[PDB]
């Protein structure tokens, strides 16, 4: 079922803690959804997807996730 917090995180593979959704419908830890998109050039952390919520900074030449993350309360 979609938007379980009991999976194991795909980032950290540790119990999830303040859980959000990624575009891709898993659920990750809030900072790891985050550092991973960032650190990933926008790229799922269980598929691989290119997401379309990330956007590159030409400023500070890094990703940055403007859309796609919703967290679960
Ligand atoms: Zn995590």
New binding site residues.
Partial sequence: PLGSVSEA??????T??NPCVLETGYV??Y???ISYLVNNEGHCPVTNKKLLGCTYNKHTNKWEVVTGIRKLI
């Fill in positions: 995180c795909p980032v950290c593979e540790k999830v803690q990750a830890c900072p790891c959804a």
